[PDB]
């Protein structure tokens, strides 16, 4: 129940990855403003379908998506802290 080193390291890794993903999503949402001229919802939806293989932000985006959609064993009620 008590573990403050490995669990906190896992939290640091997960939070770093989540902040990187949010930054990438914000960058794509700002880049998609050229066409949509919108800022609310459906702008992130229109920007989520950009498959421009000539942009380095796209490969990083799909890598972040693959990383977030995996490693479900660490992201659970038992993250080496048992609760």
């Amino acid at each position: 129940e008590k573990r403050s080193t490995t669990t906190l390291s896992f939290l640091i890794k997960k939070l770093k990855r989540q902040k990187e993903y949010q930054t990438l999503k914000t960058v794509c949402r700002t880049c998609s403003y050229r066409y949509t001229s919108d800022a609310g919802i459906e702008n992130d939806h229109i920007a989520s379908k950009c498959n421009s293989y000539d942009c380095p932000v796209f490969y990083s985006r799909v890598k972040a998506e693959r990383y977030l959609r995996d490693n479900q064993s660490v992201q659970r009620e038992e993250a080496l802290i048992s609760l």
């Binding site: 989540q18 960058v27 700002t30 001229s37 800022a39 459906e42 939806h45 942009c55 659970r76």
Partner: protein, 461 residues
Amino acid sequence: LHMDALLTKFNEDRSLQDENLSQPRTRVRIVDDNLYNKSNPFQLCYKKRSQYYHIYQYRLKTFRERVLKECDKRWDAGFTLNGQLVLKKDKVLDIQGNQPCWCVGSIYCEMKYKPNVLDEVINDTYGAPDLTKSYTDKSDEIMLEDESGRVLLVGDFIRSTPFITGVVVGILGMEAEAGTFQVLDICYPTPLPQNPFPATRGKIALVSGLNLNNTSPDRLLRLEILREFLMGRINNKIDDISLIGRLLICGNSVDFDIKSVNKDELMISLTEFSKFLHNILPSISVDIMPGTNDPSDKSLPQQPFHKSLFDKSLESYFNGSNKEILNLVTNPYEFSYNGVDVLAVSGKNINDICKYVIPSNDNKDDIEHRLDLMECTMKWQNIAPTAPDTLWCYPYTDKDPFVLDKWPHVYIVANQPYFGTRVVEIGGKNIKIISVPEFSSTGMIILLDLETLEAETVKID
């Protein structure tokens, strides 16, 4: 008078009475009725975890239904204007004629980003384009979309009101000389139910933005003075200090950057916070809430911190049975403090709205502007108007938690630059909004009463 004269005047005439230390004054009891009842709305499953489109559709449908109810209640058939009768229109292309007409539709604004946010996201992406070009290559107008087009909301009533894109309204205006709709009155969603105000009673302490870091040593002395003040050591007026039934840290307990951080210094700050908690718990109850820069999820519905992340000296409080004295709570929560339903948010919704620059509302980062933003958040019945910035994938399915289903008595948005309170009257009801400032800089502590809802501040220098 000199400093020695003040000491000679005060300490020589010390009372040293009523300090028995054998029969200490019992703190006033303040309970949280939402501790065991059921269904915490903001408690999600992190293991379960674009999904934003379903939330968009649900918000649109619910808000349109509510605004249509309010309109049919206020713009009921027969409500004639000064000259002619007011008509009802289903689509935005049907409002065309020299006659009044009202319709329901969302709001479309510009909402461009601020330069500092763009610079940050560019410097933290490794390949971000010149995002400023997207705003300069392409302006200032509010429009109304209702699934069938848009019209320009011209006039004066539309300018003296803050708006955010996506919000639906019940515009009632008149087409004048082009495809530009005037505005005479605006409708908001129908008023929500509110629990009756209860009819001996104590107060609660509101603290936010401790920001315990490993570089600033001043933020620990203010915290120690706060620890000594709540225990009744500094003020010595146990007849009034014993009325602070609970303590509510509203987020931002530790300040760090997850870009460059390890487990050691975060553990140092967490042990400092745990020392504070262990020293203050035998005298007062604590309700800890996650923040924007704490070791928790970056989204808005942040789960409680952990049973870990605290020193092993607090293992007796986390055994499960001791929850009334220490309660790790979700980031948004509705505390039912002796019937006074208070909705508390760490303050990311307003801080995410303020990171935009809307080229409207002209006809600047002040306390009144943020209070107006909170009042509009309460008016629109949506805690997070900017969903893509605050919300995360899968907040809920078919029943969104941020769409308010019940108005609270006190609405707290913390981690704000300034402090300010405002009571607003929305459809015969009354909600008291409170803006809690950070404790790192301008270390004020808000004392909120529960018998009359009067907030007073306590500064610590």
